[PDB]
Amino acid sequence: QNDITQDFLNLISIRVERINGLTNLQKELVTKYDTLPLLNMNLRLSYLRDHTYPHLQVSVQSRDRVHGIEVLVVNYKFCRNTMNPFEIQFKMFYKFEDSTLLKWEILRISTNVRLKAKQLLATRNFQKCLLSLYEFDKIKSKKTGIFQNLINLLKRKTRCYLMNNSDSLIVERVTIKLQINFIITMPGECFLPMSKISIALWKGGERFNQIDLDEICYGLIKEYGVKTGLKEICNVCLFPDM
């Protein structure tokens, strides 16, 4: 009666996620226990574009495939100088498994660096060409920045006119002239572009000793700096007080 009712009552009463390339950062950081790069592709692209290669506009234009290769036409716009940037357009040929490069060629160069990057772009090593173009843009931007700063801090007392393209700035006072060379030499026959700073004084009559001015420039740039090293050279070539 009661025990059968209790037995009848006892009888009748009887995470893992998969992350991807496009995913939010919170769900990525919840399931983070390995020491691997983050798979959020937009954040990785933000690190690859905003932080390591700023002022550069890379955009993939087209990509095809034959039978087992992959062609890829991409263009770069080195926009560090906002007035007139120099562009380029590549075309690469993969091998897509045991992946090598077969061919790479240039479809166009914007005609501002075409001869300056003529000896460079015949080494057939496209990584060195890309890095040399980016560093040449950076060094050219630093050159025009330093020369505009030296003009802005000297435009009142002197006359400040440039020369050949921008490679040598000339100041003159009272007379006495001073020319500050700054040459960027692309590589050809290291692989990054290198700079060369040299000066030459004129005391009205003739040139000075190039060895002594070279030693003065070397010491006064090795000691002070570059942006604040040339200002000391203009202060010495003034010599009204010290």
């Binding site: 950081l29 692209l45 690859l48 890829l72 990584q127």
Partner: protein, 205 residues
């Protein structure tokens, strides 16, 4: 998720195009110091990390080599990166270059980029010094040779003569011919490294 797969495909191929440059930054987080705030239930990184991905492109095999990684971690009391881990062999003073850049303290990302550029120039230097002698032994101007790890001390063979070189950064600084007329043939090769390929056909004509 089909057009999103296409957008991810364009993001991946753009990441590869950016990785062709050689020196890349990639995000990273140590999972020891992933803390929770408990006032909102969200996760914030305690110490930020920055990873560099050095990747030298070869030319004899025309494919990219094994990538090298430098991982920087942000210090907890100074707001300046210090070199946490690096997968670089020990003939490159990677800690010394990191102490040399900017006096020792690295704050902004371009200050880390200069350090990554110096280490990448040393890696390309080692790669080119190996590639030149491998392309030499491919054309059999030299016989069976041996190299060091950084390819800075080689000893190849000539038709009879053994030649030993201690080569610095793309230039030969020491020559050793052993088997008065030897010294002319010793300061013959004591020049650059492409002229070594030029000068070794100047005697076997």
């Amino acid at each position: 998720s089909t057009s999103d797969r296409s957008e991810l495909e364009d993001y991946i191929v753009l990441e590869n195009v950016y990785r062709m440059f050689g020196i890349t930054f990639f995000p990273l987080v140590d999972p020891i110091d992933l803390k929770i705030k408990d006032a909102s239930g969200e996760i914030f990184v305690d110490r930020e990390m920055l990873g560099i991905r050095l990747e030298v492109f070869s030319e004899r095999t025309s494919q990219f080599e094994k990538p090298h990684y430098v991982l920087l971690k942000k210090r907890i009391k100074s707001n300046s990166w210090f070199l946490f881990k690096h997968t670089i062999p020990s003939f490159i003073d990677v800690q010394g270059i990191f102490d040399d850049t900017n006096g020792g303290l690295v704050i902004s990302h371009d200050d880390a980029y200069l350090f990554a550029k110096r280490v990448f120039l040393q890696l390309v230097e080692v790669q080119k010094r190996r590639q030149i002698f491998k392309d030499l032994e491919a054309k059999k101007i030299i016989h069976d040779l041996d190299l060091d790890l950084e390819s800075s001390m080689v000893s190849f063979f000539v038709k009879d003569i053994k030649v030993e070189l201690f080569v610095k950064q793309n230039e030969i600084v020491s020559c050793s011919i052993l088997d008065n007329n030897k010294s002319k043939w010793e300061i013959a090769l004591l020049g650059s490294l492409d002229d070594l390929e030029l000068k070794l056909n100047h005697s076997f004509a």
